[model samples]
Target: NAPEFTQSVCERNSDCDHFCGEGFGHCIRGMYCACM
Candidate 1:
């Protein structure tokens, strides 16, 4: 199963897309902008 959020991932935050945000940065598995 997958994790579900209230609204959605990367909906309100895009900082990780370029830089890195709290839960919107690169994942540990080599994925980009994977909301924690």
Candidate 2:
């Protein structure tokens, strides 16, 4: 349930150009957020 909502929790960061939300995401080696 709320899979999309869970996915949307992350926000984009201009500096890292990645999404970081609810302290559940992390920057990957490819320079992307692994919030999903």
Provide the TM-score for each candidate, comma-separated.
0.19, 0.29
- Cα RMSDs of all predictions? 7.5, 8.5
* lDDT, candidate 2, 1-36, per-residue tens: 544323332244332334444555554543445653
lDDT of 1: 0.47
What local lDDT does model 2 show for residue 20?
Answer: 44
Top model by TM-score, which number?
2
> Across residues 1-36, which tens digit of lDDT does each residue of candidate 1 receive?
897444433343455554565645654333324545
lDDT of each: 0.47, 0.43
- Pairs that collide in candidate 1 are none
Clashes of 2: 0
- In every candidate, how many clashes are there? 0, 0
Total backbone collisions, model 1: 0
Residue 28 lDDT (model 1): 36
